[PDB]
């Protein structure tokens, strides 16, 4: 048996910050469909009439943590701090976005400062781009020379998840399944 390792993705103990989102290739395996226990489940571009010769190819599973009210940004055609500077889906996205509340895993009563998102960036991400720079951001004319200070900012900001945050501000774990839908015999 070589069942596809989705359990490794959805059930991972730790999730990445969204600026450093993880990508898992799903390949050379047989998928165990196993399904509405999820607060978001949305698919895009999956438009097939014939269902008998369906083949999923180029399957990637991306995963990360964002705020409940940011999950709306993980969709084609959206804007915001997450879609502009952290995780960008393309207009023609084909695949599904899956999310669930993880307040009891990813919040801490003192505030969890381990989860971050990129706050400063001079231009938008391209689709499926991952920016992990920690270069000090130059918000002025004077160079920073890697020293923080006025107009010289660490580009990442903490979410500070706390269990008493409003539900829209609580951490959500997100899995983005992207693929191409081809028509082919097995």
């Amino acid at each position, epitope marked *: 048996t070589n069942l596809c390792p989705f359990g490794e993705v959805f059930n991972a103990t730790r999730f990445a910050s969204v600026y450093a989102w993880n990508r898992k290739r799903i390949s050379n395996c047989v998928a165990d469909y196993s399904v509405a226990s999820f607060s978001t489940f949305k698919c895009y571009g999956v438009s097939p009439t014939k269902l008998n010769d369906l083949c999923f190819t180029n399957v990637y599973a991306d995963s990360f943590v964002i705020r409940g009210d940011e999950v709306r940004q993980i969709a084609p055609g959206q804007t915001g701090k997450i879609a502009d500077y952290n995780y960008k889906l393309p207009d023609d996205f084909t695949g599904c976005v899956i999310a669930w509340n993880s307040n009891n895993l990813d919040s801490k009563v003192g505030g969890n400062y381990n989860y971050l998102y990129r*706050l400063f960036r001079k231009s938008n991400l391209k689709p499926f781009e991952r920016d992990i720079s920690t270069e000090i951001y130059q918000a002025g004319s004077t160079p920073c020379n890697g020293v923080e200070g006025f107009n010289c900012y660490f580009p990442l900001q903490s979410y*500070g998840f706390q269990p008493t945050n409003g539900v*829209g501000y609580q951490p959500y774990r997100v899995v983005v399944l992207s693929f191409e839908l081809l028509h082919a015999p097995a």
Partner: antibody
Amino acid sequence: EVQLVESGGGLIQPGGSLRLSCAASGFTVSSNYMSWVRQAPGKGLEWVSFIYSGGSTYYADSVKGRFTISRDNSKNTLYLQMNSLRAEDTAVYYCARDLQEHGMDVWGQGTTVTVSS
Amino acid sequence: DIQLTQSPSSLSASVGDRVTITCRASQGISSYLAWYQQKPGKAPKLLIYAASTLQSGVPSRFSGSGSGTDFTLTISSLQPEDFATYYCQHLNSYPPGYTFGQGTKLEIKR
């Protein structure tokens, strides 16, 4: 010397247009989040709009479709285009360099907008 | 919609007194909240962000804290230069934008 200087306010009839300017010195407008905040006379602060470092723009519901925020790199200036003005847009309009979770740290002195017949 | 209700609305207090302004959120918000001081005829001045972090240059007698829906700003020993209206501010995630409290006017007793 870090400052914001607003201009462009004045008396305008209902339905008219106004364009506010915020000339920055001491930081690069095109690299920052910038917000417009207004204060009707004897009232509190109301947030109007902001533009992100990378260009996305957002608006309070009360000005949706009538106002437009923008900026000019070469003049280091922020703008607020205001159309179809109504009496309740009457306020002092402040521009501010926006650091999001770290607050609005630099403010202009304000420009006064009076909408009246 | 999310509302920030400050209390008290107004307050008179003597020099040297301890002043505490509350901001209550009508619903759960984030861990981050900012506080501004507006003197009459002047632009607001940033005092605290991230609920408790002092803005550079602000005197140590200012402090902030809070959790859940109830946040506070505190002046440990009122100096005379501390008259103003005080506003709390939350950066909302959707729709992106800011909510302000209605403000608290603090005057000096003499």
